[PDB]
């Protein structure tokens, strides 16, 4: 128990920040989303030991990285896990972000 925070709790925190980031900053260029999704993901990542394990124990994530180069190459599991939850947040936000930006611009279409 200890922490009720889960990955989908963290993801909704990162997803709604992207809803706020996209609308306030326009970011019509699709390459500006990379700087945008990172700010929502980086800020949503927890830093406490109870929050990291409770998120890691919940559904939606593994210890397996999609990219091996993103592994921190360190002996601290805390850093490896917070880099791990971040890696999933970026690729989980990615599929919903492009659609989120596509239907956001209701000002040039009807």
């Amino acid at each position: 128990a200890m922490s009720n925070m889960t990955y989908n709790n963290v993801f909704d925190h990162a997803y709604e920040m992207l809803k706020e980031n996209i609308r306030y900053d326009d970011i019509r260029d699709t390459d500006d989303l990379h700087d945008a999704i990172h700010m929502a993901a980086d800020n949503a990542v927890p830093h406490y030991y109870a929050d990291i394990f409770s998120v890691m124990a919940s559904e939606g994530i593994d210890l397996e990285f999609e990219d091996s180069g993103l592994m921190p190459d360190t002996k601290d599991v805390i850093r490896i896990l917070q880099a791990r939850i971040y890696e999933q947040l970026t690729i989980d936000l990615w599929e919903d972000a492009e659609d989120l930006l596509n239907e956001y611009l209701e000002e040039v279409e009807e």
Binding site: D31, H34, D35, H38, A41, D42, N43, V45, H47, E66, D67, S68, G69, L70, M71, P72, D73, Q82, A83, Y86, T90, I91, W94
Partner: protein
């Protein structure tokens, strides 16, 4: 023992071949006495019909010719109801083996020594002592004789059933039949053959002394089949190949070079009955792989007959007659579906000259003959493995390390250690001058655009097409994203800012960004790759849980570059010093751990005996 005095009595008249002529004359007189002494109790008894005794040798002076006629006369009176029915065999030996003694003084003493011998359980174990003492003294006499401890072990592992017909293509002295009878003491239809008349005399006489029927023994050429039939058991110690007069004589045995041990191997295979086991002693020279004409022989033998066991006998088990290394095969016909057992015999000291082979050394082989897995000196080998090889070699071996050679090779690594670092040292001190013509920004020289994220659809180990991620090369997708062969930089990883140069098209992951120059007239990509590597782009990145480089922040990076003529000259200097750094440190890491294992295992060398 008693027979040795007879050999010493036979002296002057022959007086040239004390080795075998004395043994030949003794066996000639001993066989004549055997028939006479056997005929005495067969029908003569006493007085009912009386027979003159031991008077044929000195009939009339010496007349060995008249002895043959009186010996026939004795048998004529006996034929009134072995030896007697097949008297032609015993009568033929008198024709083939001639008498040579011509001294009455010498002949008088031996014949009186002959009548003293008691043939009831006495002459048997004194004849083999004579036979054994002959081959050690004559050497060449070992051609017709094989070690009794070898024969005793061979016949024991054979285990002949009472309902069997043991056959020897070269009966020699008949030691196999003697051991076969002794093995089954607590009958077998023995068959034999031989070419040399002396061995036929010695073999027939020795079989009679052990009370073994000599109805199957004959004198003929075994390689020449004439017309023959298989037998239940075939055990022999075959000889060694020669074609002095037999060069063109064995025409129908085509393929062979006149090898006795090989032609007899073909003979034993033809003369082995269905379900009949066998054991043939052969030299190692004919079971090797280079024996081209014999590879067909080993091929059919391994294909048909069940060759399941071979025993390695040390060089040279076969007496002073020959120092060659020999071995005994165990092909039992039937089906060949079984892996080959192998035993390797070892003795306390080299043999042959003196202290030869003993029956104590065979004790392990007899007990473990049917137990396949045995430690130390025996193993099991596969049939199809050596049959599948290029050449069929039957010379099997056992399948069953820190030295001072390590420092010798470790000194060579130190030779290569200084070889490159001194070259690396002085190649770094060149200091080639250069002046920068431009001082541009990354904003207005190249195009920086990152790729999209791939869903891990393909990540092949090998491929003609690569994929670059946040750091390094991971993945081999078949679809390119950036057709240009340009520069890529990591963006989102903890090792972001890594500069990787691509010489071929690829696909760009969302974790990296592609750099493609706007005008090729200003910058040489490898020079820019090194100068971007020199800027340490990881300081540009910001973030808490992860480090991230923004595309806008990379545009604002200033880079000073010289002329294209100089950029290639500097890039070639920059790339060479970099490769030496990676290689020298890599060899240092290998050399660092190799010195650790060399130093530890050398310590364990003197602290542990095993």
């Amino acid at each position: 023992n008693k027979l040795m005095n007879i050999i010493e009595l036979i002296r002057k008249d022959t007086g040239i071949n004390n080795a075998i002529d004395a043994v030949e004359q003794l066996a000639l007189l001993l066989l004549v006495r055997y028939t006479h002494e056997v005929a005495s109790n067969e029908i003569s008894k006493e007085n009912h019909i009386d027979s003159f005794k031991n008077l044929f040798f000195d009939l009339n002076v010496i007349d060995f010719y008249t002895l043959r006629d009186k010996l026939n006369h004795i048998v004529v009176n006996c034929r009134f109801s072995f030896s007697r029915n097949n008297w032609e065999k015993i009568e033929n030996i008198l024709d083939q083996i001639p008498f040579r003694i011509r001294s009455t003084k010498i002949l008088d003493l031996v014949i009186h020594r002959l009548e003293e011998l008691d043939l009831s359980e006495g002459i048997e174990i004194d004849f083999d002592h004579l036979l054994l003492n002959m081959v050690k003294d004559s050497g060449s006499s070992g051609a017709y004789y094989s070690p009794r401890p070898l024969i005793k072990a061979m016949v024991r592992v054979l285990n002949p059933k009472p309902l069997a017909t043991v056959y020897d293509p070269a009966m020699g002295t008949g030691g196999v039949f003697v051991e076969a009878k002794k093995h089954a003491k607590g009958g077998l239809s023995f068959i034999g053959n031989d070419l040399s008349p002396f061995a036929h005399l010695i073999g027939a006489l020795n079989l009679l002394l052990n009370d073994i029927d000599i109805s199957g023994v004959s004198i003929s050429d075994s390689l020449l089949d004439r017309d023959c039939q298989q037998y239940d058991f075939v055990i022999s110690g075959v000889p060694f190949g020669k074609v002095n007069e037999l060069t063109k004589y064995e025409y129908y045995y085509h393929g062979y070079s006149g090898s006795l041990e090989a032609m007899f191997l073909k003979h034993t295979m033809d003369k082995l009955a269905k379900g009949g086991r066998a054991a043939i002693v052969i030299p190692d020279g004919i079971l090797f792989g280079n024996a081209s004409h014999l590879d067909e022989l080993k091929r059919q033998l391994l294909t048909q007959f069940n060759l399941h066991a071979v025993l390695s006998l040390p060089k040279g088990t076969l007496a002073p007659y020959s120092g060659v290394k020999v071995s005994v095969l165990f092909f039992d016909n039937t089906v060949s579906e079984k892996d080959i057992w192998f035993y390797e015999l070892r003795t306390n000291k080299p043999l042959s000259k003196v202290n030869s082979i003993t029956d104590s050394d065979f004790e392990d082989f007899t007990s473990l003959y049917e137990r396949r897995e045995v430690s130390e000196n025996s193993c099991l080998i596969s049939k199809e493995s050596l049959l599948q090889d290029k050449t069929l070699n039957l010379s099997f071996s056992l399948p069953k390390f820190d030295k001072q050679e390590m420092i010798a090779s470790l000194k060579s690594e130190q030779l290569s250690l200084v070889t490159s670092i001194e070259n690396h040292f002085d190649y770094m001190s060149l200091n080639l001058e250069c002046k920068y013509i431009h001082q541009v920004k990354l904003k207005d020289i190249c195009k920086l655009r990152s790729g999209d994220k791939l869903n891990k659809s393909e990540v092949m180990d090998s491929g003609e097409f690569p994929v670059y991620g946040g750091n390094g090369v991971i993945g081999f997708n078949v679809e390119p994203n950036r057709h240009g062969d340009s520069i890529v930089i990591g963006k989102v990883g903890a090792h972001c800012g890594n500069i990787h140069f691509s010489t071929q098209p690829y696909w760009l992951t969302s974790n990296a960004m592609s750099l493609e120059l706007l005008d090729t007239t200003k910058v040489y990509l490898p020079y820019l790759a090194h100068v971007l590597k020199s800027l340490e782009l990881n300081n540009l990145a910001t973030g808490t849980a992860q480090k991230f480089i923004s595309i806008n922040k990379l545009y604002e990076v200033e880079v000073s570059l010289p002329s294209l003529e100089k950029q290639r000259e500097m890039s070639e200097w920059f790339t060479s010093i970099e490769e030496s750094k990676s290689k020298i440190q890599s060899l240092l890491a290998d050399f660092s751990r190799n010195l650790g294992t060399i130093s530890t295992e050398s310590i364990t060398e003197k602290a542990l005996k095993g």
